[PDB]
Paper text:
One such TUT family member, Cid1 from Schizosaccharomyces pombe, is a now well-characterized TUT, which was first demonstrated to be localized to the cytoplasm and to possess poly(A) polymerase activity in vitro, but more recently has been shown to possess TUT or poly(U) polymerase activity, in vitro and in vivo. The TUTactivity of Cid1 has been shown to be important in promoting mRNA degradation of polyadenylated and 3′ trimmed transcripts mediated by Lsm1–7 and the exonuclease Dis3l2 (12,13). Cid1 has been extensively characterized both structurally and biochemically, revealing that a single histidine (H336) in the nucleotide recognition motif (NRM) is predominantly responsible for discriminating uracil over other bases via a mechanism that was proposed to involve two alternative conformations of the H336 side chain. We used an RNA-binding-defective mutant of Cid1 (K133A/R137A/R277A/K282A) to improve the resolution of our crystal diffraction for higher resolution studies.
Residue numbers in the entry: 41 to 110, 114 to 206, 207A, 208 to 381
């Protein structure tokens, strides 16, 4: 597995975010914080997502949150203040939920490349990010592995939730589930199920986990990055059974069925126009903190087929005995599904 490992680190250096790009995004966060401070002093602007957890690809987008205690006008007023500051953007309202999307920066020196998403009181997203940051700190192998999977999923056109496949966060959870509960010895302990974990309730959910990393013993797993990646691909390709099983972080053995979960069901809720929005559980990934949410709800039968197929193709490629193996095929673009 040594040469594949070499390949992975080489690609990882290519696709990871530069310090320079990281610096510019950081500066942008500061400028945006000033704008919020002028109109609301007590309000806070918080970064989350890939950039905050160090799990970001090149040219990633910022995910930010404006949070406040106890109001309805601040979303629009912020957007207006941002436009006035020379930013270019959109103000979006759907299902009574407001979002701000910045697409360019004309005055402060970030250029037209600048892109940003701002949301309001998304506390759960912040805590999800905190967990991911902890694991990223825990083992050096996690960051390259996650980045490569993200790159792989994007290229194989299985990273489009709106078109039937899986979100980036879902794949990270798949990786994390594999490292904690599948591979032996475990790369990771389960921080949620730790003895030292203390209950913390935010928005009616337990978001608490053991975040005292220095007291956590070193990993008993000494596999190379290439070895972890191959095993991860092979597991979902063959071992994992999506029809009966749930990806979860709430079980010591990581064993949960949809039947016990109650996610065998196809399920419906009504949108703002009272259309039927069906929640599929064809792929079941139970969000670590938001238990009700299925991160995999977006996957469809055609979608799961494509995802599983790429997993098989990846495994077969790495398992292949016809040297020299074409590792670059792993990241070559796939014909886009019509």
């Amino acid at each position: 597995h040594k040469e594949f490992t070499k390949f992975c680190y080489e690609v990882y250096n290519e696709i990871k975010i530069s310090d320079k790009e990281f610096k510019e995004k950081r500066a942008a966060l500061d400028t945006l914080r000033l704008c919020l401070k002028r109109i609301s002093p007590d309000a806070e602007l918080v970064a989350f997502g890939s950039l905050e957890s160090g799990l970001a690809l090149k040219n990633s987008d910022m995910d930010l949150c404006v949070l406040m205690d106890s109001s309805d006008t601040i979303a629009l007023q912020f957007y207006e203040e941002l436009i006035a500051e020379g930013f270019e953007g959109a103000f979006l309202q759907a299902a009574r939920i407001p979002i701000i999307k910045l697409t360019s920066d004309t005055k402060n020196g970030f250029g037209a490349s600048f892109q940003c998403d701002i949301g309001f009181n998304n506390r759960l997203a912040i805590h999800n990010t905190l967990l991911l940051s902890s694991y990223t700190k825990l083992d050096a192998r996690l960051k390259p592995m996650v980045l490569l999977v993200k790159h792989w999923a994007k290229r194989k056109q299985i990273n489009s939730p709106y078109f039937g496949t899986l979100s980036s966060y879902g794949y990270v959870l798949m990786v994390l589930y594999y490292l904690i509960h599948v591979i032996k010895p475990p790369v990771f302990p389960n921080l949620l199920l730790s003895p030292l974990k203390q209950e913390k309730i935010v928005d009616g959910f337990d978001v608490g986990f053991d975040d005292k990393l220095e007291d956590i013993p070193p990993s008993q797993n000494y596999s190379s990055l290439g070895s972890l990646l191959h095993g991860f691909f092979a597991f979902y390709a063959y071992a994992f059974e999506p029809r009966e099983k749930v990806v979860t972080f709430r079980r010591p053995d990581g064993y949960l069925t949809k039947q016990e979960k109650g996610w065998t069901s196809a399920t419906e809720h009504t949108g703002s126009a009272d259309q039927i929005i069906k929640d599929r559980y064809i792929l079941a990934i139970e969000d670590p903190f938001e238990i009700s949410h299925n991160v995999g709800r977006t996957v469809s039968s055609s979608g799961l087929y494509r995802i599983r197929g790429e997993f098989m193709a990846a495994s077969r490629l790495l398992n292949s005995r016809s040297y020299p193996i074409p590792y670059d095929s792993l990241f070559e673009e796939a014909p886009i599904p019509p």
